[PDB]
Amino acid sequence: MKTPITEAIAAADTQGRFLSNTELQAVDGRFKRAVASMEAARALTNNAQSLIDGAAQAVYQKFPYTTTMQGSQYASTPEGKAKCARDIGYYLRMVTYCLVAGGTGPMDEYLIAGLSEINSTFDLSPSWYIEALKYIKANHGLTGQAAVEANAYIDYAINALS
Amino acid sequence: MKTPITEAIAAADTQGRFLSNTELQAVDGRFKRAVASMEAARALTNNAQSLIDGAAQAVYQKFPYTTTMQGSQYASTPEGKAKCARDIGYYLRMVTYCLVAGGTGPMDEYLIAGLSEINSTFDLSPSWYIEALKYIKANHGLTGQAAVEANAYIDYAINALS
Amino acid sequence: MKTPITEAIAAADTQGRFLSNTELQAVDGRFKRAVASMEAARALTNNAQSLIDGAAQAVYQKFPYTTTMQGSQYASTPEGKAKCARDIGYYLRMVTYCLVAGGTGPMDEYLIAGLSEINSTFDLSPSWYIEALKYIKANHGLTGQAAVEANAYIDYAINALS
Amino acid sequence: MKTPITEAIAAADTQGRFLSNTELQAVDGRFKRAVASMEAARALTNNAQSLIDGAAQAVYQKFPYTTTMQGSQYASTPEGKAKCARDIGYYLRMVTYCLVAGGTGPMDEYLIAGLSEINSTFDLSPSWYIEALKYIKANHGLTGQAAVEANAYIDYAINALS
Amino acid sequence: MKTPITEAIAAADTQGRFLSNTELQAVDGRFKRAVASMEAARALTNNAQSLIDGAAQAVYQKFPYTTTMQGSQYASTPEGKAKCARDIGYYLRMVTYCLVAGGTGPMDEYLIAGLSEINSTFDLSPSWYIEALKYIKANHGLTGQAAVEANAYIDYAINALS
Amino acid sequence: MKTPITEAIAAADTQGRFLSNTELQAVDGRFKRAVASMEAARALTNNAQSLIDGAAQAVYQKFPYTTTMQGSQYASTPEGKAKCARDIGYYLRMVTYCLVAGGTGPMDEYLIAGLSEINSTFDLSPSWYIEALKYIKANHGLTGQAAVEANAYIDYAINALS
Amino acid sequence: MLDAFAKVVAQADARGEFLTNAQFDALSNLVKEGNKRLDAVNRITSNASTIVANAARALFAEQPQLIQPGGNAYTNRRMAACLRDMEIILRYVTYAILAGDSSVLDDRCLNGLRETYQALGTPGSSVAVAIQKMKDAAIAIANDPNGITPGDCSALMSEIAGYFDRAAAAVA
Amino acid sequence: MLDAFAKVVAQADARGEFLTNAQFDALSNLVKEGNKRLDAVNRITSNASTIVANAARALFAEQPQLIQPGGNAYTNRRMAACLRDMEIILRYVTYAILAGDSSVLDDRCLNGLRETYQALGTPGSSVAVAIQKMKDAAIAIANDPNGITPGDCSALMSEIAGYFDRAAAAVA
Amino acid sequence: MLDAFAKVVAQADARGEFLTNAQFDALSNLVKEGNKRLDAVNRITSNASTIVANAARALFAEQPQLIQPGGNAYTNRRMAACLRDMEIILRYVTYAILAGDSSVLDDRCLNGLRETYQALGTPGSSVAVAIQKMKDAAIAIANDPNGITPGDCSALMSEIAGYFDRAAAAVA
Amino acid sequence: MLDAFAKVVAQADARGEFLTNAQFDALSNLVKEGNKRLDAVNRITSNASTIVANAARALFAEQPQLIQPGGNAYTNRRMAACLRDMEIILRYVTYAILAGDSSVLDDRCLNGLRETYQALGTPGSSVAVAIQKMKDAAIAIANDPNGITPGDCSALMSEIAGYFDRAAAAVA
Amino acid sequence: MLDAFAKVVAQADARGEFLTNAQFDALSNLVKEGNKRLDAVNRITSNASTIVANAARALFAEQPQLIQPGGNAYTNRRMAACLRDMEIILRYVTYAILAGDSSVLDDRCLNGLRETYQALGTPGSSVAVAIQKMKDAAIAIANDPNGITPGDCSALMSEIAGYFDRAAAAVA
Amino acid sequence: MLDAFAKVVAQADARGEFLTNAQFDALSNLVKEGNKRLDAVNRITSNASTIVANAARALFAEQPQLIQPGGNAYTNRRMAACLRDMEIILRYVTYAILAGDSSVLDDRCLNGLRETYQALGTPGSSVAVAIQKMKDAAIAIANDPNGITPGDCSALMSEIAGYFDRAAAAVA
Numbered sequence A, B, C, D, E, F: 001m002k003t004p005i006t007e008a009i010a011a012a013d014t015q016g017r018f019l020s021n022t023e024l025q026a027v028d029g030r031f032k033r034a035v036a037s038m039e040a041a042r043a044l045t046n047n048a049q050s051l052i053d054g055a056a057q058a059v060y061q062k063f064p065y066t067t068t069m070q071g072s073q074y075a076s077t078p079e080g081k082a083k084c085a086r087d088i089g090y091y092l093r094m095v096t097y098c099l100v101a102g103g104t105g106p107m108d109e110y111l112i113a114g115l116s117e118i119n120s121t122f123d124l125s126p127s128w129y130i131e132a133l134k135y136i137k138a139n140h141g142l143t144g145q146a147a148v149e150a151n152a153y154i155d156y157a158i159n160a161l162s
Numbered sequence G, H, I, J, K, L: 001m002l003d004a005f006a007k008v009v010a011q012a013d014a015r016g017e018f019l020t021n022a023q024f025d026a027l028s029n030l031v032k033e034g035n036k037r038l039d040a041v042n043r044i045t046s047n048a049s050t051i052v053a054n055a056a057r058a059l060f061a062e063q064p065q066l067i068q069p070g071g072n073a074y075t076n077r078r079m080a081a082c083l084r085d086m087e088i089i090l091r092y093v094t095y096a097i098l099a100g101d102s103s104v105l106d107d108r109c110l111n112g113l114r115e116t117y118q119a120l121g122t123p124g125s126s127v128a129v130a131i132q133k134m135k136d137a138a139i140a141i142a143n144d145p146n147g148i149t150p151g152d153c154s155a156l157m158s159e160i161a162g163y164f165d166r167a168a169a170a171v172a
């Protein structure tokens, strides 16, 4: 899994080397940054339900056809609405993992790999998840570097969906 | 050339990726560490002549046969003594580059690659340069993290000579 | 470009062989099938405008949000409507090429390669084009083997969009 | 084994594809051609003994040294004559397989692969088998497309022996 | 070209090595053997015409059909007889090259590579050239190690024709 | 293991060939040379102890710091002196193997591979072993081709240490 | 790989025999039934995306543990690979239908597949279920009387069902 | 590579156009002339060995310098490579005949071939001669009235002659 | 590839010199300006998809010939490759911004690129236009005063603009 | 490979859960202890050559059979490979120390290593001895109170000792 | 691979010993017997084609089931591979004769060969028979008193017979 | 690559001729001079390390700009590569001496070497100087009257000098 620490090791191991300052500095930056990342991860976790709930409605608001069109891909039934909120929760939970891990690894591994295939196979619009993510970005209530951290991983997901 | 910054880019470019927090954190650690590295680089530069002079004698002291045995590999002639001090200067100057660059790149590129071949071809003992380097380590007059920085690159050279 | 004829040659040339009955039979099947394919290609060409026009409305009907949501990806402006009909024309025209060429080559080359990237980059739903294609399939007015031919390439596009 | 059908599948599978009209047409040509191929295969089978017997003498006639020179490679002994007729039977039987299979596969697999090595190791002249094959071609009593089919595989063998 | 000397160099160069006794010994064996090889090469050259003439008739004797069957592959015409003797001369001349070079290189390069293709394309029996070569072997008039040398290269050709 | 014989086989086997004069000549050179090599191997074996003893002192003489400096790498203790003489014995014994085997194989395999790593890790100067080897070369008491043989392998070691 | 025709030739060669009248007759029937086989292949192939996606949806509805966190079909990479496998199996089954012999399926798809799933922790029984769903869908689509010259394709549907069952057996 | 049909499609796409009635008609004629094309390909292919060997023999008879020591066609390796090239050219020409377009020949065979012969010292003019010999033989074999349903194949023979001339031009 | 720091070291080594006080001071300023550089890289990278897609849309609106049939940006494969190139260029420019030196851009991206477009028939002038659009967007996003500690980033924006102009020069 | 942080994330994802307050606290302590971990890694790495060479010397002194002719550590190639292995193990252990998890060590180093030594005839028990020597040296160097801000690193030394013991267990 | 000389050196090194007078004497005899060994290798090699082909013919005469349809030596590909194997074995045996040690044969030829034949369905006992035929032929040719300086080669013929028997044992 | 003997054979084959008495005589002299050639090769090879290192030292003493910072022989990597090249050239020259023909040197070493140095910025004239130094040393060592059966090797030394001059010409 891709983290600043595993990337530092991978770089050394690729060349059959022991680790050097060239690599310990990277890891130190990670350790220093963790204070801001952990604030963000905690706040997003603590406020996850209201973020998810808010995000779901933001989607339904922008794309009201998703609440009305017939189809298992849509949130026009209770089961569909439950799957949509689950998915949004997945996204948010992955953001929190990225923050805890200090890198994109968890999202890359658990969510991004396979994403386009899954979205195309199950007829899910990327634009739906982007709206959800834009809501979370807008309303997470973080400021300063904690917000920079959260937004970096949220925008990473948005970019993966574009 | 291997620096925290070029290693961050290389990692991204290897995978056809844009740069992510996973990489910006590494570079930030580099930028933070630079304060200690630059103190060290400056002090070693400012005191280079006395360090080199001291280091040369430390060698001659430990290995007095180097000042007496006949041979162009030895420092038994004025020209030999001049080449020895030049070489020691090279080592020290490379340390300062490593500190400025924030990684092993300069030493790897300019000094370590080819080192064993050159030492074996010209009949130069690694143990000579190690003693010189141990002198520099002992007498650089740095304390705190500036000393940790200088010593990391000096010991890196020692390891390359073992 | 992938046609029964180029696939026959490619198979022979891959093995450094001259062509054998094993390959001439394939090409004969192509030549025999061409009667049905050419009927289909002609009818679809002759009726292209009404098919395109009908197909466009079928989309707008099923996905009325496409005629109302603001965005250059939507057909909510005259320019958007023009681009949508152009695209549908592209699809239909590719079907006719596949029929003329006797294989998927033209569609593979001109339309399918890059398709998911283009759709995701410009925020175009595959489901839109599928509906258009289902309309064309339903209303092309072909029967017998001419219809089997047209539908094989239309469904091929549908599969490529899933 | 190389048949129109296995070549169609191999082409699809090579590219990780499902089969398309581009491939079903080839197979249809095979199915249509089978009527002529099966006529030929049946007639050659029914008349195999007289063809073989006739073919053997055609060889002995053109190359009478084969009936007189001492050597296990020659048909100068009863055992040699039996091996020669067996071999000719092999050739004819392979032709019938090619016709049944709708391609060169059986002959390629069972007879052509290794052919030059075997002929050179056992001192058998290709020109002997060519004469046998030319006799079969001349005297198979097929007309129309049944003859085109038989001759395509007979000439294929002749080409493999040149 | 494969000679004891080029094989010695190739072995060294393959490993990026200078030449060692391991290789100079091989070359010395070559230099010592050259006395016997050069005797053989000289005698075969001096007696080439009578050997060729004798060899040609030995073939015609064993395979009299070659002097009577119609065909440009046969020696049934003056031009055919001239080509046959030329070819035999080629073989003999290659033997002499092998002896001079101290290895199979010349024969490998100028004669063996392509041999089966040429023989099969022009309908020439290997057994013809073997008989010619067996005549040369039987009648070269060499004894001792000069004969061992000549026969090694003649049998090499025979093996290449089997 | 690299010998004239194994190199001859390796060359043949690399090309899927049987052995030819091109290779038997090499081996004959080996067999002829063996008379001189075996004289040398025997004399060096019979006189090994005095050669080793003499060689050890030659080193200590040229590099007297090796008998006085503190360190397990030096011969300043009885155990160090024992290891030094053992090593010299190793070198001499390898020379004798090279002579017996007729090539560099044994020395390459048992001594040269790993040599620079071992010398650098244990802080042993190549120049020490070169002096030992120069003593053996000077004082082996061989003349003629027996001396050429011994010196070829001794100088090979010297070259490997440069 | 072999096809119905090469299969017969291969058996004949092993015995050193020419084809019998009976074998020609058999193979002539195969050729006479060829159009139906082409329709089946076309139809199943033309609907490959829906067959897979509808079978996947049905699987996960019946076995929600597969898509709960900690499962095998959980995460998009694992989902993608699962859908992929269903696509792959359907693909090889369609090859088999065209060829009129399973050797391509067996060889290139089915062999080592049980051991592969066992090594990954993928429940074979679940894969078998997905295969059976695709089977029922594939057959309904292939044997649909609408839009095609009427006749009986029953023998062929049973053969087709056979390839699907074979595949399901190989993993279950 | 392209074929007569893909060639037309490719031109049409470049203009963004549907096919015209005229183009359908052209292509329908191509299909109507298909049997003749299959006979040609079959016949030339069925006689590939003799076409080559007879053309080689004729070349070396007319240009004995090629097979005299010090030549290009001297030694078996050089002879083999020469015969091979004649086989290769004939092969690509037959592909071209099947496809009804030269792109396979041009692309996969003819491009860089002059420069290749120039680098080796192989006289291109001689290769061209061999090609022309194969052409005359190929055409006589393909257009032989014996053993085939009578009709006119003249247009096709000219097309065929065109591929051979094209190949000869590419090296000469 | 080099970075602002290795660049200085490399120049120093060529002269055999230790760093001067002036060079340390320069490099200390670089480090002092590091946060701004990280914000720029983050911001441009965080908006990479929209930068590209909006620049593409603007290009094709201004130069509709590129997407008319027979063009270079026509067909999805050619469109995909075009968008890709815009993504690639933006990517290497962001590397350059992080490193504070263009060697990665020049080396790994820009060299041979003009010749590559010339060989394909891709109009370099059009690529340059796309680059300039991305530049204007990238800079507006990077230098946006909202949501960030206020200060002056002007020097950096000019450096950034420099990498974009450099890239546009390399193809135009 | 995983690190202390990814390890926790991976466990959480398997359960489909957000992190608990307790887990954040744990991980915050890890970050708070980071400097010590960097010192350890630095120190062990900075002395890698002496650690290995002194451990090798000590091994061969205690087990001279390893370097007697006919042994495993006899000949320079076998010696080189032995020293190499000690270097490799120390290397992976230092990776593990940085990561705060053994997965890199286990995965990339330790798995198949026993079987490898068993196939070669290398006595695993001897390797384990060398590992333990390196451990004692590594720890003395890492935990040396001289030249470093005083505090307690005891927990970390035990973790470090754990990686070494793990490696020794894997071969013994 | 080893040769009679390297074999002795390898045994000596394992003990850490110089060669004894007895070993020098042994090896001097080997060198003294070298000419005979070169004659054997030459003679067997010079007749390799006939040895193989005559042994093949004899095998198939004694075991006609091998060449009846459905057999292992039936079809030209299987025949070719069989003859090839006989050529290969003879080849490695001749290497062994030159080297005066079987390590090349054992190593590069004989190991895994039984398991290989068992996997293919090739009857090892039949291969052994072919090897024995080649042996009897090889020895008669190598030990033929005509055209060579008279002496006794009996020891060598027994050694040679030993390599053949070894090979036959390895497959039987 | 060719050797003095193959060189003659190759010329003869081009003419289609048997060797003349004159050519046999020439080649017999070559064989008669073989021992001297083996001594030369042995001697130069046996002293390869000192020849190179002494020639390098002499070069850098005469051209100190090569080892001043900013030069081509400055830094250990560039030094290593330089020494390597001197080793390589000496190596190929010794091959040439053994073969009695330069084709190995020319082919495998000398061709493209000028262009290679020109691309790198390595001054060819300096390389030529190093080659000449090695030449003078190689010849003094090879032609040293001590420890060898007396005779005249002058012709051979001139040939040897020729290979060195050839190499120096190729780069200068």
Ligand SMILES: CCC1=C(C)/C(=C/C2=NC(=C\c3[nH]c(/C=C4\NC(=O)[C@H](C)[C@H]4CC)c(C)c3CCC(=O)O)/C(CCC(=O)O)=C2C)NC1=O
Pocket (backbone or CB within 6 Å): C033, C144, C145, C148, D021, D024, D025, D028, G032, G033, G034, G035, G036, G037, G038, G039, G040, G042, G142, G143, G144, G145, G148, G149, G150, G151, G152, G153, G154
């Ligand atoms: C290019 C690929 C290709 C296809 C797809 C093809 C189909 C094809 N199917 C046909 C007939 C048919 N097709 C079917 C098939 C079916 N009816 C049923 O409900 C059966 C179970 C179902 C099979 C699923 C039947 C029963 C016939 C009429 C009899 C026959 O042709 O065998 C015919 C004869 C004309 C016609 O009947 O319409 C054609 C050309 N030919 C081709 O060359």
